[PDB]
Amino acid sequence: GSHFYFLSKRRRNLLRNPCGEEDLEGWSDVEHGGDGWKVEELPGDNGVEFTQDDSVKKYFASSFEWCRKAQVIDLQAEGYWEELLDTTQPAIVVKDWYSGRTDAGSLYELTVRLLSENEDVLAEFATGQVAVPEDGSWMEISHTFIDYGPGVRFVRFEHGGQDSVYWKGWFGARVTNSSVWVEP
Ligand code: NI
């Protein structure tokens, strides 16, 4: 019956369609560079298996110019009261998984912002451009926002990838299993 108990019980991934099971539905500000985003089934051509969740069967593949996509989550509509967010400032945990092919290098970027109701940027985590592992292995990136102050209403998740070779097709970074949740 404590708050810790309820927030633990209500913890769930607030991002829609994290793996591409619904194609691009639920993603906004979609930028299709080169040949655009494409959804592929695991394990990818010249790629490795997703040993970590098993319910993950698909990923998004990028191309030869930047492919980006974003989602904005309304924390209040998901039932996190403004008073709770202002006073307790519970942990907002962001994770993403990325990999590349073994026949070509690639690059990935993630930018996550906490936003007020008027879209003021209250906190920001940005990777910059990251070199994807050459060996095809899946890598997790994780960030926890805490002590971010009052006023947080939205989380804007944005990520992207491109290849390092400039080749027609889908040789860029692959992303999947993206998540945002609130934990005590
Ligand atoms: Ni309790």
From Swiss-Prot:
The record marks 46, 64 as: Important for carbohydrate binding. Pathway: Protein modification; protein ubiquitination. Disulfide bonds: none annotated. Keywords: Cytoplasm, Endoplasmic reticulum, Lectin, Membrane, Microsome, Phosphoprotein, Ubl conjugation pathway. Changing residue 166 to A: Abolishes binding of glycoprotein targets. Residues 4-184 form the FBA domain. Signal peptide: none annotated. The keyword Ion transport does not apply. A carbohydrate binds at residues 101-103, 166-167. Disruption phenotype: No visible phenotype at birth. Mice are viable and fertile, but after two to four months, gradual hearing loss sets in, due to degeneration of epithelial support cells and hair cells of the organ of Corti and spiral ganglion neurodegeneration. Its main location: cytoplasm. GO terms for cellular component: cytosol; dendritic spine; endoplasmic reticulum; glutamatergic synapse; membrane; SCF ubiquitin ligase complex. It is found in: Cytoplasm; Microsome membrane. Detected in brain and cochlea, in epithelial support cells and hair cells of the organ of Corti (at protein level). It is a peripheral membrane protein. Changing residue 168 to A: No effect on carbohydrate binding. GO terms for molecular function: amyloid-beta binding; carbohydrate binding; denatured protein binding. GO terms for biological process: ERAD pathway; glycoprotein catabolic process; protein ubiquitination; regulation of protein catabolic process at postsynapse, modulating synaptic transmission; regulation of protein ubiquitination; SCF-dependent proteasomal ubiquitin-dependent protein catabolic process; ubiquitin-dependent protein catabolic process. Component of the SCF(FBXO2) complex consisting of CUL1, RBX1, SKP1 and FBXO2. Predominantly detected as heterodimer with SKP1; the heterodimer with SKP1 is not part of the SCF(FBXO2) complex. Substrate recognition component of a SCF (SKP1-CUL1-F-box protein) E3 ubiquitin-protein ligase complex that mediates the ubiquitination and subsequent proteasomal degradation of target proteins. Involved in the endoplasmic reticulum-associated degradation pathway (ERAD) for misfolded lumenal proteins by recognizing and binding sugar chains on unfolded glycoproteins that are retrotranslocated into the cytosol and promoting their ubiquitination and subsequent degradation. Prevents formation of cytosolic aggregates of unfolded glycoproteins that have been retrotranslocated into the cytosol. This is F-box only protein 2. The lineage of its organism: Eukaryota, Metazoa, Chordata, Craniata, Vertebrata. The chain holds residues 117 to 297 of 297 of the full protein.
